Amino acid sequence: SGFRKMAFPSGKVEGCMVQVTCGTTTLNGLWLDDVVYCPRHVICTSEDMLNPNYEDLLIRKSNHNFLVQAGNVQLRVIGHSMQNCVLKLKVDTANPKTPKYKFVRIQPGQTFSVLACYNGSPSGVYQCAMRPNFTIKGSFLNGSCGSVGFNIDYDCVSFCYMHHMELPTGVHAGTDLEGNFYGPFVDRQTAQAAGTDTTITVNVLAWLYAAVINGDRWFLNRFTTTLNDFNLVAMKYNYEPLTQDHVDILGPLSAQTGIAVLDMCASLKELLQNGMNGRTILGSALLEDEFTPFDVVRQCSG
Amino acid sequence: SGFRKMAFPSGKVEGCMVQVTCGTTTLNGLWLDDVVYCPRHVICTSEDMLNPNYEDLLIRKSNHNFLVQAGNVQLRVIGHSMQNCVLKLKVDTANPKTPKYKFVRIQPGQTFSVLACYNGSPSGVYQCAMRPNFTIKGSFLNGSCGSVGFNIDYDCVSFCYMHHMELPTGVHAGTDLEGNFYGPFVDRQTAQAAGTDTTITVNVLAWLYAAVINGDRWFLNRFTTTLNDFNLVAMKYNYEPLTQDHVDILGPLSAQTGIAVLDMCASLKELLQNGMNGRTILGSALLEDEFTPFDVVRQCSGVT
Numbered sequence: 188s189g190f191r192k193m194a195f196p197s198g199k200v201e202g203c204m205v206q207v208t209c210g211t212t213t214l215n216g217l218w219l220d221d222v223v224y225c226p227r228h229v230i231c232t233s234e235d236m237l238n239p240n241y242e243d244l245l246i247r248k249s250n251h252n253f254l255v256q257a258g259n260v261q262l263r264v265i266g267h268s269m270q271n272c273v274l275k276l277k278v279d280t281a282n283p284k285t286p287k288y289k290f291v292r293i294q295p296g297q298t299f300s301v302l303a304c305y306n307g308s309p310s311g312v313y314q315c316a317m318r319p320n321f322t323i324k325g326s327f328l329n330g331s332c333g334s335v336g337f338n339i340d341y342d343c344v345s346f347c348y349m350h351h352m353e354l355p356t357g358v359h360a361g362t363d364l365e366g367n368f369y370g371p372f373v374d375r376q377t378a379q380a381a382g383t384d385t386t387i388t389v390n391v392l393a394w395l396y397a398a399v400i401n402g403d404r405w406f407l408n409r410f411t412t413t414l415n416d417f418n419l420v421a422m423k424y425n426y427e428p429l430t431q432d433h434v435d436i437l438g439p440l441s442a443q444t445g446i447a448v449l450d451m452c453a454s455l456k457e458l459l460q461n462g463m464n465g466r467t468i469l470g471s472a473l474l475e476d477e478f479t480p481f482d483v484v485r486q487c488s489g
Numbered sequence: 490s491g492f493r494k495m496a497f498p499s500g501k502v503e504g505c506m507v508q509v510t511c512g513t514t515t516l517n518g519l520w521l522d523d524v525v526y527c528p529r530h531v532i533c534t535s536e537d538m539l540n541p542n543y544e545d546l547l548i549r550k551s552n553h554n555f556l557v558q559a560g561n562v563q564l565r566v567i568g569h570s571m572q573n574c575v576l577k578l579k580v581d582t583a584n585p586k587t588p589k590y591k592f593v594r595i596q597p598g599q600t601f602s603v604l605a606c607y608n609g610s611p612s613g614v615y616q617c618a619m620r621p622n623f624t625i626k627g628s629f630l631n632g633s634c635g636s637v638g639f640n641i642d643y644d645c646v647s648f649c650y651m652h653h654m655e656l657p658t659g660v661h662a663g664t665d666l667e668g669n670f671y672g673p674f675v676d677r678q679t680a681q682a683a684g685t686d687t688t689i690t691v692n693v694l695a696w697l698y699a700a701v702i703n704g705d706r707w708f709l710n711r712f713t714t715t716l717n718d719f720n721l722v723a724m725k726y727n728y729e730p731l732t733q734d735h736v737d738i739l740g741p742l743s744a745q746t747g748i749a750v751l752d753m754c755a756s757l758k759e760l761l762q763n764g765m766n767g768r769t770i771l772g773s774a775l776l777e778d779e780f781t782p783f784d785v786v787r788q789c790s791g792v793t
């Protein structure tokens with residue numbers, strides 16, 4: 188029993204973190220085989236960031252303009268190139284702690300663990316969801332760029348996020364490990380803002396199943412509702428529409444608890460237009476949307 | 490910017506987790522140097538659990554009744570002894586991945602990270618507080634016993650919790666690495682119940698400081714308070730009383746924000762009186778009490 192916001196164990200990823208310095212900028216790099224991956228803005232001065240020409244800036248650098256430190260050993264850089272917004276630094280030593288890994292690009296609504304790092308050293312791990320507006324509500328200070336987000340399946344690390352920036356509202360933006368940005372953002376110091384966000388409805392329903400699994404049942408009701416009748420109510424409260432595929436993805440949880448998906452929607456609808464009336468669910472006064480159906484199944488089954 | 494319930498990186502502890510089996514009972518062990526630590530109830534059948542005499546049960550065991558597995562490798566058990574509620578299995582191999590470590594016993598209100606494990610394999614990490622009633626609000630299933638809680642200070646892992654059981658209300662109880670339970674709980678399947686819990690007041694204040702550090706001031710007010718008036722009010726909301734040691738512990742946060750501790754106490758009093766009125770603080774609609782002052786300074790300063 189119990190339900191916590193649980194991150195994946197971070198050991199496989201700690202073994203890949205390094206410090207990348209170029210000029211006056213120091214940040215974090217990801218060391219996999221004989222390549223270090225890090226944000227391309229490491230090569231910019233603050234004046235460069237106002238309007239950077241990365242191709243032109245990178246040509247002015249040689250391999251010796253990059254210092255890479257893993258622990259107390261300085262890795263020799265033998266080549267450099269860009270892929271989209273990530274810099275790839277070839278080093279003369281392969282990382283012996285390189286795990287089985289893949290680069291994957293995730294969708295809004297999917298969760299992942301973040302290993303927050305500074306100067307190549309881990310500070311902590313936490314669990315994040317990609318918001319529908321493609322930001323993440325992270326915890327990042329100066330020097331955090333290059334920290335990565337990831338999932339683990341069996342022995343294989345799926346890197347999905349590399350951190351690049353903080354927006355004026357204090358939320359964060361980054362790229363996949365192929366350097367493609369999540370959301371309409373650019374690595375330039377210019378006016379940028381997070382769009383209006385919505386709530387990940389499939390994740391809220393999964394978390395309501397987690398609460399029922401853990402004995403919170405006061406919000407279940409006698410009513411039922413159609414998917415289109417629910418979707419019309421949800422859209423008025425800035426909730427993402429529920430698709431039929433979402434319902435199929437909630438099948439396992441509905442079978443475990445015996446509560447039809449549309450019966451849980453009927454409860455969620457009543458929660459949205461009535462509130463919680465001073466009560467809590469799993470220790471929260473808000474409807475939580477940073478647990479996917481798979482996350483609930485995993486934590487409630489090992 | 491931002492504020493998250495952040496756990497310590499788990500790598501140094503991941504390399505210490507093993508699987509311990511005795512009979513048909515399996516659970517997790519902690520392998521440090523040539524010793525594996527685990528809950529002593531690994532030697533019990535379910536019939537033994539109502540009124541076990543662990544001295545009598547252990548004397549009937551031999552070294553070869555314990556199978557300890559680290560990955561695909563079996564570790565030969567060469568000795569065994571009990572210390573309070575933990576079993577110490579000596580093995581013929583010292584753990585090459587042993588970190589620098591310490592055994593500590595924490596206070597009510599302090600936090601630590603839990604590496605939840607099953608069959609010797611870590612499956613997740615999260616941050617916990619020792620509640621005032623000496624339980625933790627964990628996430629644990631059958632097979633999780635022997636999972637550990639820990640902090641990191643400098644280069645050293647401070648182990649502070651080993652998991653033993655789940656109480657009827659779904660909260661959790663365990664021991665330090667000496668085998669002494671937190672609270673009045675015992676490793677018997679007898680009627681046990683968490684007492685009534687309280688809110689960790691010094692942690693709520695530290696968290697309000699994190700909100701200020703992150704740029705929010707809407708909950709401050711022009712009032713101050715005496716410490717004794719603050720405690721008279723706060724205890725009517727089932728908040729733990731605030732001591733002068735606590736006030737000194739909030740010093741660094743108070744000095745960084747320019748808000749005196751007793752002025753933050755005034756704000757807390759008003760929050761308890763009014764609630765948030767449809768607002769949130771660092772993403773929460775309730776007053777969070779599972780961040781210590783040291784947690785706040787660490788996450789707001791980038792300690793690695």
Ligand SMILES: O=C(N[C@H]1CCCC[C@H]1Nc1c(C(=O)N2CCOCC2)cc(Br)cc1[N+](=O)[O-])c1cc(=O)[nH]c2ccccc12
Nearest residue numbers: 228327328329330332351352353373374375376377379490
């Ligand atoms: O070091 C961080 N950022 C650097 C990294 C490389 C240089 C540009 C900058 N990134 C941004 C930012 C930005 O982060 N800031 C933060 C406030 O000051 C300026 C604007 C905004 C836009 Br718009 C575009 C970019 N960009 O294109 O890289 C940074 C990261 C973090 O998560 N949180 C922090 C908290 C405090 C201070 C710094 C950070």
Ligand SMILES: O=C(N[C@H]1CCCC[C@H]1Nc1c(C(=O)N2CCOCC2)cc(Br)cc1[N+](=O)[O-])c1cc(=O)[nH]c2ccccc12
Nearest residue numbers: 188530629630631632634653654655675676677678679681
């Ligand atoms: O395997 C777990 N526990 C086992 C470990 C071996 C000894 C007995 C039992 N510990 C207890 C418990 C207890 O946990 N339970 C669990 C529900 O059914 C019975 C009562 C209560 C008291 Br009172 C005393 C003890 N004791 O003395 O060990 C266990 C751990 C967990 O965190 N969460 C779970 C969720 C579901 C099922 C099991 C667990």
